[PDB]
Amino acid sequence: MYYPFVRKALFQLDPERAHEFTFQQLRRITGTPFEALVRQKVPAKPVNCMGLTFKNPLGLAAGLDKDGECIDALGAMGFGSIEIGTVTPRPQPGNDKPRLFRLVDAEGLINRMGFNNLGVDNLVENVKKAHYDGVLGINIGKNKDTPVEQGKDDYLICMEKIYAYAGYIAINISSPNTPGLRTLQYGEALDDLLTAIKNKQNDLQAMHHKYVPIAVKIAPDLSEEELIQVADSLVRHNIDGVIATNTTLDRSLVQGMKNCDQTGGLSGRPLQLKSTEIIRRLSLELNGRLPIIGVGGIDSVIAAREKIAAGASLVQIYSGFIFKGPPLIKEIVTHI
Numbered sequence: 001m002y003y004p005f006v007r008k009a010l011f012q013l014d015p016e017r018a019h020e021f022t023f024q025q026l027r028r029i030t031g032t033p034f035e036a037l038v039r040q041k042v043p044a045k046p047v048n049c050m051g052l053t054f055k056n057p058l059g060l061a062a063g064l065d066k067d068g069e070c071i072d073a074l075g076a077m078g079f080g081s082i083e084i085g086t087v088t089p090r091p092q093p094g095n096d097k098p099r100l101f102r103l104v105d106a107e108g109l110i111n112r113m114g115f116n117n118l119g120v121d122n123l124v125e126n127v128k129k130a131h132y133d134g135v136l137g138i139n140i141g142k143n144k145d146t147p148v149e150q151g152k153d154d155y156l157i158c159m160e161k162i163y164a165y166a167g168y169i170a171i172n173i174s175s176p177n178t179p180g181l182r183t184l185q186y187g188e189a190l191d192d193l194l195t196a197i198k199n200k201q202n203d204l205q206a207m208h209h210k211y212v213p214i215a216v217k218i219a220p221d222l223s224e225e226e227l228i229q230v231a232d233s234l235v236r237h238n239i240d241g242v243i244a245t246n247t248t249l250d251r252s253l254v255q256g257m258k259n260c261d262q263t264g265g266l267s268g269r270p271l272q273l274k275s276t277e278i279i280r281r282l283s284l285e286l287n288g289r290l291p292i293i294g295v296g297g298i299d300s301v302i303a304a305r306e307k308i309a310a311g312a313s314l315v316q317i318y319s320g321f322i323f324k325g326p327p328l329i330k331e332i333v334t335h336i
């Protein structure tokens, strides 16, 4: 049916209850013939990035399908790639509810989920049963109780288990909803993490006889100097790619709006400009040494093209998918 009516109905429910209802129906049809109800034709626009071939530049950002339960249904919708997760070594409930809020007038969202997921072992089993033909990205992170200074082991543990089933691996060290998680992107802490990750990738390549690229997901709340250091570190350690950007703690564009003071990360339209400008500065520093996957407030063909012009090789969407639904996918892929 007409998505606006779909949205109209969904927006009457609590934000998370709306997501749970939606995924309840998707899981109900994913991998079955019902899948035709959400499927849509999309032209192919192949892009080579990180040694991989993406059928099209548009991907589903991480956070929607955290446990990889609806890979096939979502894929049928047209996405060139799908990023599942964030997943942690052990299952965890996440923060207390409510943890998700809508800013309808700003076409944005604020969340403090806290990595609510069923664990990496469960996710691996879901992936084994999926038939998706696009690129599958697996996004991983640290369990809440794991001391952030020993967080590196949680990443390595997940890497060992998903290596054989991932198109690329996404390292999440930018979530604002896990205490201390963002500290991992600064100084020696970042260098030590990247050193371990690249070494683990090296061992896994010898074990599985194949190279699985790794991309690091950074926050949008980094200063010019910090952004330069991160970019340089990524280059020195030969990281395969960088995903910019995650949600922001900034609230300067949503003052005076309902839920504007809720704690958490802000996404959607209010993140669009900040995100694009970070991509541009990032791209300037990287100087083509490694690709950028741009994400943040993309809600139209032009917004996507702006990210590409700023320097991104690929783009992902989340919030915009919730406000504009399936039609957005078709629009971007068709005209990007």
Ligand SMILES: Cc1cc2nc3c(=O)[nH]c(=O)nc-3n(C[C@H](O)[C@H](O)[C@H](O)COP(=O)(O)O)c2cc1C
Pocket: 061, 062, 063, 064, 066, 085, 086, 100, 109, 110, 111, 113, 115, 139, 172, 217, 245, 246, 247, 266, 267, 268, 269, 271, 295, 296, 297, 298, 316, 317, 318, 319, 320
């Ligand atoms: C409800 C929700 C859950 C998310 N969970 C994650 C997650 O688990 N892992 C991750 O890397 N990013 C997560 N994000 C961030 C998105 O993947 C994306 O980086 C950010 O929302 C910017 O894109 P958007 O403006 O198009 O939503 C989440 C965002 C939202 C709104």
Ligand SMILES: O=C(O)c1cc(=O)[nH]c(=O)[nH]1
Pocket: 001, 002, 037, 038, 039, 040, 325, 326
């Ligand atoms: O009702 C439809 O046709 C429909 C709904 C939806 O969410 N996606 C799609 O491609 N079609």
Ligand SMILES: O=C(O)c1cc(=O)[nH]c(=O)[nH]1
Pocket: 086, 111, 112, 113, 114, 115, 116, 172, 174, 175, 176, 177, 178, 246, 247, 265, 266
């Ligand atoms: O699950 C979460 O709380 C979460 C993770 C992340 O990386 N970004 C975000 O906005 N929320």
